[PDB]
Amino acid sequence: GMIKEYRTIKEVVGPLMAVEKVSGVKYEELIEVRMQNGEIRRGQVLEVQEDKAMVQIFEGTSGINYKNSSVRFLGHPLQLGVSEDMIGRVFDGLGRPKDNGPEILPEKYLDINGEVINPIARDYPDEFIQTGISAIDHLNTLVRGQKLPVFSGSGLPHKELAAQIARQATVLDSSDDFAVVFAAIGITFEEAEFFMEDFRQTGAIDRSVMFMNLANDPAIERIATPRMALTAAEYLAYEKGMHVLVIMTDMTNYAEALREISAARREVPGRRGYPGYLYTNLATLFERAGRIRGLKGSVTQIPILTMPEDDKTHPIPDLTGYITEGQIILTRELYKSGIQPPIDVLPSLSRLKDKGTGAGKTREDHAATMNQLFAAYAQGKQAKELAVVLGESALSDIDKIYAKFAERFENEYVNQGFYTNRTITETLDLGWELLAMLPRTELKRIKDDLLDKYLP
Amino acid sequence: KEYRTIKEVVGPLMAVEKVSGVKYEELIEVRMQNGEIRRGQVLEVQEDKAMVQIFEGTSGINYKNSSVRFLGHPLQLGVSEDMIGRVFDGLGRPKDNGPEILPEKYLDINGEVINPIARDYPDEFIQTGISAIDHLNTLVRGQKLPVFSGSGLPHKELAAQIARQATVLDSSDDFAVVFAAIGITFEEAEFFMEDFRQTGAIDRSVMFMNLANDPAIERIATPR
Amino acid sequence: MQIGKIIKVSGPLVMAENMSEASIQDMCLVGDLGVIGEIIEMRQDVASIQVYEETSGIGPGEPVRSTGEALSVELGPGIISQMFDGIQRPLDTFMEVTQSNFLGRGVQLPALDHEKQWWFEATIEEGTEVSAGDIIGYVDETKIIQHKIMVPNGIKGTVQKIESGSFTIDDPICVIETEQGLKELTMMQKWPVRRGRPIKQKLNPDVPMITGQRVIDTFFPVTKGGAAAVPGPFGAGKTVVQHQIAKWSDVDLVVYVGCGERGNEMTDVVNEFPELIDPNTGESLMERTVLIANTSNMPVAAREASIYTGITIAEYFRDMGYDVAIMADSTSRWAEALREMSGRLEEMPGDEGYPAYLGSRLAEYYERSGRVIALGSDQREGSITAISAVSPSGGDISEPVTQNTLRVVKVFWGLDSSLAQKRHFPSINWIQSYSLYSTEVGRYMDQILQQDWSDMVTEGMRILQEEEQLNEIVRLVGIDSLSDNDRLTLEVAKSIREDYLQQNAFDDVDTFTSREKQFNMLKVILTFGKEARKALSLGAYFNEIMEGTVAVRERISRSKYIPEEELAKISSINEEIKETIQLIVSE
Amino acid sequence: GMQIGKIIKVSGPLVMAENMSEASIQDMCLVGDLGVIGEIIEMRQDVASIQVYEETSGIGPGEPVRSTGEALSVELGPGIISQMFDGIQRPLDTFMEVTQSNFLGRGVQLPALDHEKQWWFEATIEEGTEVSAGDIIGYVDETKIIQHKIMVPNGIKGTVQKIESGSFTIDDPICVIETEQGLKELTMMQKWPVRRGRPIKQKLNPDVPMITGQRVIDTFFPVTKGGAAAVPGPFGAGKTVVQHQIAKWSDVDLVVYVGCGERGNEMTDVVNEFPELIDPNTGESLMERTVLIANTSNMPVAAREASIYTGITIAEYFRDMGYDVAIMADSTSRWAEALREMSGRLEEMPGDEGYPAYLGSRLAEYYERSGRVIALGSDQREGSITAISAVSPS
Ligand SMILES: Nc1ncnc2c1ncn2[C@@H]1O[C@H](COP(=O)(O)OP(=O)(O)NP(=O)(O)O)[C@@H](O)[C@H]1O
Ligand SMILES: Nc1ncnc2c1ncn2[C@@H]1O[C@H](COP(=O)(O)OP(=O)(O)NP(=O)(O)O)[C@@H](O)[C@H]1O
Ligand SMILES: [Mg+2]
Numbered sequence A: 001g002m003i004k005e006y007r008t009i010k011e012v013v014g015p016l017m018a019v020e021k022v023s024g025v026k027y028e029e030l031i032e033v034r035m036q037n038g039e040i041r042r043g044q045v046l047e048v049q050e051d052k053a054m055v056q057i058f059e060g061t062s063g064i065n066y067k068n069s070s071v072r073f074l075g076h077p078l079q080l081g082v083s084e085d086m087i088g089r090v091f092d093g094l095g096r097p098k099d100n101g102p103e104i105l106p107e108k109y110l111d112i113n114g115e116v117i118n119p120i121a122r123d124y125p126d127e128f129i130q131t132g133i134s135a136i137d138h139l140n141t142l143v144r145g146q147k148l149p150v151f152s153g154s155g156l157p158h159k160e161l162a163a164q165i166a167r168q169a170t171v172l173d174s175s176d177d178f179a180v181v182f183a184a185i186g187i188t189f190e191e192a193e194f195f196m197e198d199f200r201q202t203g204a205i206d207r208s209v210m211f212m213n214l215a216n217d218p219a220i221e222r223i224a225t226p227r228m229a230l231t232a233a234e235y236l237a238y239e240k241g242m243h244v245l246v247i248m249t250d251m252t253n254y255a256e257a258l259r260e261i262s263a264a265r266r267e268v269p270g271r272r273g274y275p276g277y278l279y280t281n282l283a284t285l286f287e288r289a290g291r292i293r294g295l296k297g298s299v300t301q302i303p304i305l306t307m308p309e310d311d312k313t314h315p316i317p318d319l320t321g322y323i324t325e326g327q328i329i330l331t332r333e334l335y336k337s338g339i340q341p342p343i344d345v346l347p348s349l350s351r352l353k354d355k356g357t358g359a360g361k362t363r364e365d366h367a368a369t370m371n372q373l374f375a376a377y378a379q380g381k382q383a384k385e386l387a388v389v390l391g392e393s394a395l396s397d398i399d400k401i402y403a404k405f406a407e408r409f410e411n412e413y414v415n416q417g418f419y420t421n422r423t424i425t426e427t428l429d430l431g432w433e434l435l436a437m438l439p440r441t442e443l444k445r446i447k448d449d450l451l452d453k454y455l456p
Numbered sequence B: 001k002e003y004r005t006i007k008e009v010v011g012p013l014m015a016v017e018k019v020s021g022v023k024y025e026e027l028i029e030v031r032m033q034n035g036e037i038r039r040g041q042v043l044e045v046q047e048d049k050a051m052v053q054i055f056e057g058t059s060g061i062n063y064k065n066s067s068v069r070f071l072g073h074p075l076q077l078g079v080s081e082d083m084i085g086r087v088f089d090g091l092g093r094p095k096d097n098g099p100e101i102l103p104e105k106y107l108d109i110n111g112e113v114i115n116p117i118a119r120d121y122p123d124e125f126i127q128t129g130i131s132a133i134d135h136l137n138t139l140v141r142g143q144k145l146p147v148f149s150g151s152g153l154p155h156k157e158l159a160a161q162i163a164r165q166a167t168v169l170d171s172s173d174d175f176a177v178v179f180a181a182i183g184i185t186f187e188e189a190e191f192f193m194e195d196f197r198q199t200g201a202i203d204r205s206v207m208f209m210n211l212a213n214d215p216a217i218e219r220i221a222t223p224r
Numbered sequence C: 001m002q003i004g005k006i007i008k009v010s011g012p013l014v015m016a017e018n019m020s021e022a023s024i025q026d027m028c029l030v031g032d033l034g035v036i037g038e039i040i041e042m043r044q045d046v047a048s049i050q051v052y053e054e055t056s057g058i059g060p061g062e063p064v065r066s067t068g069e070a071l072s073v074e075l076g077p078g079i080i081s082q083m084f085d086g087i088q089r090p091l092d093t094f095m096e097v098t099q100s101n102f103l104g105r106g107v108q109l110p111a112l113d114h115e116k117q118w119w120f121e122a123t124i125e126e127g128t129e130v131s132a133g134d135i136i137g138y139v140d141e142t143k144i145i146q147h148k149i150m151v152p153n154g155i156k157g158t159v160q161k162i163e164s165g166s167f168t169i170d171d172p173i174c175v176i177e178t179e180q181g182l183k184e185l186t187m188m189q190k191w192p193v194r195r196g197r198p199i200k201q202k203l204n205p206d207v208p209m210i211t212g213q214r215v216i217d218t219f220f221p222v223t224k225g226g227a228a229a230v231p232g233p234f235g236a237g238k239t240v241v242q243h244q245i246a247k248w249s250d251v252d253l254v255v256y257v258g259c260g261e262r263g264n265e266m267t268d269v270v271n272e273f274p275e276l277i278d279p280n281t282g283e284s285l286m287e288r289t290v291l292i293a294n295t296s297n298m299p300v301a302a303r304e305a306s307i308y309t310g311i312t313i314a315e316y317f318r319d320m321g322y323d324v325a326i327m328a329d330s331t332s333r334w335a336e337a338l339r340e341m342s343g344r345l346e347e348m349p350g351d352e353g354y355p356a357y358l359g360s361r362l363a364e365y366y367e368r369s370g371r372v373i374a375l376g377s378d379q380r381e382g383s384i385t386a387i388s389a390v391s392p393s394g395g396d397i398s399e400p401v402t403q404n405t406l407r408v409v410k411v412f413w414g415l416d417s418s419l420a421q422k423r424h425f426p427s428i429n430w431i432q433s434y435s436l437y438s439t440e441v442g443r444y445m446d447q448i449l450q451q452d453w454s455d456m457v458t459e460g461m462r463i464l465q466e467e468e469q470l471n472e473i474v475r476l477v478g479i480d481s482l483s484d485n486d487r488l489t490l491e492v493a494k495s496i497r498e499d500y501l502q503q504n505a506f507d508d509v510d511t512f513t514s515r516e517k518q519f520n521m522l523k524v525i526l527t528f529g530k531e532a533r534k535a536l537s538l539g540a541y542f543n544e545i546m547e548g549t550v551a552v553r554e555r556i557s558r559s560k561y562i563p564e565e566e567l568a569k570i571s572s573i574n575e576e577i578k579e580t581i582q583l584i585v586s587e
Numbered sequence D: 001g002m003q004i005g006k007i008i009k010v011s012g013p014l015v016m017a018e019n020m021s022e023a024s025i026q027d028m029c030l031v032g033d034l035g036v037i038g039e040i041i042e043m044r045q046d047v048a049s050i051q052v053y054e055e056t057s058g059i060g061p062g063e064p065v066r067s068t069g070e071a072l073s074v075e076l077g078p079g080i081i082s083q084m085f086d087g088i089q090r091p092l093d094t095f096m097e098v099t100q101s102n103f104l105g106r107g108v109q110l111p112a113l114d115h116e117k118q119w120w121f122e123a124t125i126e127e128g129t130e131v132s133a134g135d136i137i138g139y140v141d142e143t144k145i146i147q148h149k150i151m152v153p154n155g156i157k158g159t160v161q162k163i164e165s166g167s168f169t170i171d172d173p174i175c176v177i178e179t180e181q182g183l184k185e186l187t188m189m190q191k192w193p194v195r196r197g198r199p200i201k202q203k204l205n206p207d208v209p210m211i212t213g214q215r216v217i218d219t220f221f222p223v224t225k226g227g228a229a230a231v232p233g234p235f236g237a238g239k240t241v242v243q244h245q246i247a248k249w250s251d252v253d254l255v256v257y258v259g260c261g262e263r264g265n266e267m268t269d270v271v272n273e274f275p276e277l278i279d280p281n282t283g284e285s286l287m288e289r290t291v292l293i294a295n296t297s298n299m300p301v302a303a304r305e306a307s308i309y310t311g312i313t314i315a316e317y318f319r320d321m322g323y324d325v326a327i328m329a330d331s332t333s334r335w336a337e338a339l340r341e342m343s344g345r346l347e348e349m350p351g352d353e354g355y356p357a358y359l360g361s362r363l364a365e366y367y368e369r370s371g372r373v374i375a376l377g378s379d380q381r382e383g384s385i386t387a388i389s390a391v392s393p394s
């Protein structure tokens, strides 16, 4: 026995275990539980006082016995063995290979919590990423280094949207292709298999790293999975110079695992039983994105979450939206109308679009037409609502136009198809065609120099 | 006997420990580190602890360096006939730069319930001077008759008009108005003050003025 | 020196025994790594310590050393234009010293440059009697700001010797003769951040700040020395509001506290402000700005430190006679740190788990804002204007951080997600918002403008309030029922909303509106409504008036883009409205 | 293994017992003088929290508790098809004969299968063959249609030393495997803990539509073999009829019907009617492809959870043989409500609406056990479980 083993388990409650008569244990230290059958389970020190330690077990505490099970403290935090050979390989939620491929000797081991980027060392993200999806490129622009999640719902095609983004995304310069780091968190085989099949069909699998926690894997492992994935991503980006696109789904499963631990520890809850530190904990993931001055690489995050009961005020989408740099919201109403992708632009947002667009980056008309399209669509939806309650006759002649604008905007602009890749030029041109439906005097968001040059 | 034992402060509420002989609803005084005095009321008393509400709020109070004094009686108003013509704030302190009232007696501001057997039924006309009230909804001496209004409606002007015109036809020089302003704006307060002063209604009135900018727990005491 | 021993580590909380010689508020070096923490409770020899750095890898048996000093700031030349973390470590020097792009721990760094030479200009004669706040000289720290060197609190006596020259902030520049002997002064003073810097007298904050944001200055103004909160849902525009005020408000100095928010937002400020330069003046916004950054994924307890570090630096410049704006984005993140520590301390929780002292911590912070007479014989005035974002879960303003804040602040800019979702920015709900300074500001504006501004504001809000009533009538009985006068009210209300309230912070001209331009824009909007109502009474029809005024209503809608130098084009619209309407009624 | 616990608390289905420090989490135990069957779910010092699968009326502190040393398990082997079990796999007809009662007693211990029944084992693998988990060594014609394939258990690997065809009970050694640890004897029966998913090689896409013969389903809302479908609806809306229709007519090999916290008469209906529904092609009844798990609304509440895991494990066992299985869970709300009841008695911090915080992952883990798979074994055969679940929202 290289490491001292303790048979001093004194409490086993769900994922929680208490261990007595210990010494030299540290907060967040990695532990291993050895059982009589020889199974090895891993865990993490949640707190230490005097000679006692509280630990959370990743694989659960089933079968654990005070006499049969021994605990050993490894003297370091949970780390990921990183290496360039991880590209093209598939791992489980704890970073162990699961593809029956060749063994991998890590270049080095990195604490999966990582470190905070010094704010003054950051390079502000401003490189337009052409996803080829108009509702995003034009109205909720993605830039390289951003964290921009998809907010969705059960039964909605968020996996199709995410795979289309990964398939079509490119900066307009001569940069190398994105390396993709994919984290599966509590999702079904079929959800995970959709991504696998798309990555293999395009060949993206050859430039991808995948960390697979599935719905049959222990729920507490979900808490380590995105930290494993972000540690690989930051290593590939800042140590190897790659542009990394991180896709993580489903973050609702992540927060529910956090709540499982929090509830077992009997912490005092915030709203809906979620821990008071849910915001801070989520931020330690989503802030691991961006660019660093003097470094060539980057980390772009597309987290994906399902809003419980389609409610955006639920703590999980709510606190995520307080952290991330916008959000792309899918709705069931647009999805039942056959709009693909079913993006509702009205509650969607990108916070980094101003410096990534305009003359020299996309085109000079980008910001003004974006603002005008958004305003007209808002008025048009309002007219449509009034026509539902009061009939078409109730609408005024101008509001009849806006209702028709909103209809064409959804059917022809947003609804482009999951295998359609529009250039930013085609997107901007399509915008002017819709704006041409409206009277020119209604285009208050656009100055005359642009109107005279682009309006048909 | 001053206690340096304030335990915690929650909004307008304050907890005091190691107290003895304290009574429910007893008046208290907080001596702050800056030396100002804030009055309050015992809401709950148990064992050696007392829970109090501070009318002026707890902002700016350093409880470790402030002391509490229990005064041995409920909150009272020093009443005198000289209150006619005077303007007070929500806590009964002079607001018109006039002299302090010399009270004839002090009265628990909760008052007491009138024995139903001792009650006389409301009788006799009060002329408000407003046709819709006087004719169709006549105000009678001793009645409670409220005005239900809404924000932006002119209940301000109606209140001033009734204060200004109300009279009894039966008697001379025995009619007085007591006006209580609760959470009103500065402009609303300006309006009531000038109206009472310019017409002389102030000379038969007593005014208690709590403004929106004032501490809001004062409002509990103001109508009482 | 006494060495303590860690007995417990739980996230940001560390407990240590054998600390009987230490006291509450002492800073500590915790564990083998010597991470930086502060004692927040003392029971016998056992200290509860709030650690301002990551505590992963620390456990019982490790040493703890108290420095014997409270959490403090260095105040002196070299503070302006810096970006500090939450405990005033300069972030640029942090990078240079650790040679890393990431934040390590245990790094002790002086806040200011102690070797830089500054020119100290002595302005007081030897033999002069001085006390706290008296100015003995100054340093031209930036082109914008003259850094006044004040006698520190606790010092009183006679100036024995002083002279101008080049010095570091460590060099004695002045000898004062006190009752307790000779004392030397430097250009630098230290101050414990949990204690408000003393003043002579608090005053009523009654001078309106010019934020340049039309809806705020006009309908919900804040005064110099006032306190405003901006609660709103995510994406509603709190940070943009605070950036607009930090960029354009007519204060002397801005302190921006990034409390538990995004790292890129601080990156943006520190890179953009050195580039925002008035061409004639040649001065950048960074030359009047101090930045405190503790991002959302930085140590959670350092969110509290960042708030007190910011307000203390604000007070120091207030004491020099300056007007200061302190922006806290966002105070909800501070409240979350208090809730986290309260739970680790196993205290009894309050509403939503926040500690019972949450309200009084917030009150204590806003008590430090305000307009003051500062210490010193010149009895000069200064002020701190506190602008705080609140981030209520789900936008529910009935939650405890918002409600406790609204109990003590005077101004509520309530952001509204439905306005944000029609791209109506700033998303301030003009029905629910309020400013308790409105009446006094209106009277001040009337006097300083020599114009009846207060009645224009009252009329603007009256029209907006009628629109709310009319909108309800429209749903209940249809748009057709409304009289021509009602339709006109809806047109003017829409003009206030789209031509005046809506203001794009990313437009080169819309981003800022001077007091003078605001007056002219609001006058022409209201002038159209009055002239149009006059036409209606003379028998014209609403549709006839609308059809005949397309060109002039278009000038109204674009008056927000008129340059500040060309204000006559806005006021000339008044004449055009009157002549166009006069033609229409004359038929 | 001599440790005897002592009850210190009885609160409905929750029992606490001290002097339990030698027992393992998830071990079964016999509780009280009556020895009612329960499961350890939490351990604090020497005190076990026990979830009891039988009525606890009349039990009190001071009575003994004995651990069986084994997790909640099913017996898997010939004799399982056409049976009706309770939630912890006790056969209900044998229960009636052993206790001589029409009513459900407690503390009754009954093997799931008939350990004295004689079965013909047909050996199909040759001696000297290397085998691992899932390999088929022979079979038993349990029905005229369903071959009960005898698979090497998980954890066993080695060389077939001796094998023989003949007539055996499920307790007799039928095969000897030579393993690294030594010689190992195999019988026709294997045990499996119901809380652990039976391992597979890999999952496959469920893409073949099941024929339910219900027009609205097969046309507009079809489910595939290996898919999962939820049927939420108010009371009286028809969830149970839909599940009976699918149990009767779907084109799968076997049906496991889990009556979880519903009406006793509905289970009686199935045992009455399925033996009378004869397939015209084979002449076999529906009862000859069906396993029934019954734990009615008035039966012990914690056994609602047992009934779910007992059913899905049995379905996985036949899946591993290469069969397509449908499992019907009527209704999963009663299982969720069992978790809520225990969660409150344990004084846990609540999740959504009083349910435990682990409700979502328990549901997700259950549905992840459904699916189309390549089973373990060198032949890489395919099987599937299609999960149809009633939900009964207030
Ligand atoms: N005054 C404004 N002018 C123009 N656009 C604006 C304005 N205010 C907000 N926006 C837009 O709204 C976005 C969100 O603003 P922001 O200030 O980041 O919201 P927030 O309230 O701080 N959200 P959060 O940090 O999650 O609490 C900006 O990135 C702009 O796209
Ligand atoms: N497909 C059907 N064809 C004919 N009758 C039906 C059908 N579905 C439901 N019914 C009728 O509706 C009754 C109730 O159906 P049932 O399947 O028992 O509802 P339930 O959803 O299971 N209610 P509950 O068990 O309390 O949750 C049946 O007894 C039939 O009378
Ligand atoms: Mg913000």
Ligand SMILES: [Mg+2]
Binding pocket: D239, D240, D241, D262, D330
């Ligand atoms: Mg039913």
